[PDB]
């Protein structure tokens, strides 16, 4: 399933930018969960990993 | 009115985002404090709740 990963990743990285729509998700089961990993995924690059490069530069 | 909770959520959500539009306010009466409401709730979450989570990790 290497093209359908290719895909998806271009489509994920695109959501990580903040722009572009998460249609994929209508063949996936058990939708609830997709939601909630998406959930966190986002909250820890946003809020935890970029908040760190922030306050990294303002210590050194 | 489980159900228009369960769909207004995901879409309320969406919007903390930045993605989406807030096409449902079509059947509200007032959308004047519905709209002062929601700018409130975008400043508190954006402006004061995530910059008091930035300065905490500075201090520490
Ligand atoms: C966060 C940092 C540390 C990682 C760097 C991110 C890259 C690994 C991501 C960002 C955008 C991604 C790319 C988005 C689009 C494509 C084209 C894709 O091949 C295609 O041309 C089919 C899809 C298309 O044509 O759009 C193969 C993967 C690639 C290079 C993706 C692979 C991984 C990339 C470079
Ligand atoms: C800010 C932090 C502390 C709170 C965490 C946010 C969650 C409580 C929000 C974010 C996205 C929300 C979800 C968006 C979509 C859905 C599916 C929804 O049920 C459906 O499948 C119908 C709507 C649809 O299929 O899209 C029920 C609520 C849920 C899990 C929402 C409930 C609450 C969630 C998980």
Known sequence: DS???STFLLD???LTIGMGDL???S???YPV????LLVTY???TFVLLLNMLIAL???T
């Not at 969960?33 to 909630?36: K, L, P, W």
């Open 33 to 36: 969960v997709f939601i909630i």
């Open 27 to 29: 063949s996936t089961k």
């Open 42 to 44: 986002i909250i820890l």
């Open 57 to 59: 530069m303002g210590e």
């Open 23 to 25: 249609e994929m998700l």
């Open 3 to 5: 093209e359908t990963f």
């Open 12 to 14: 994920l990285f695109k």
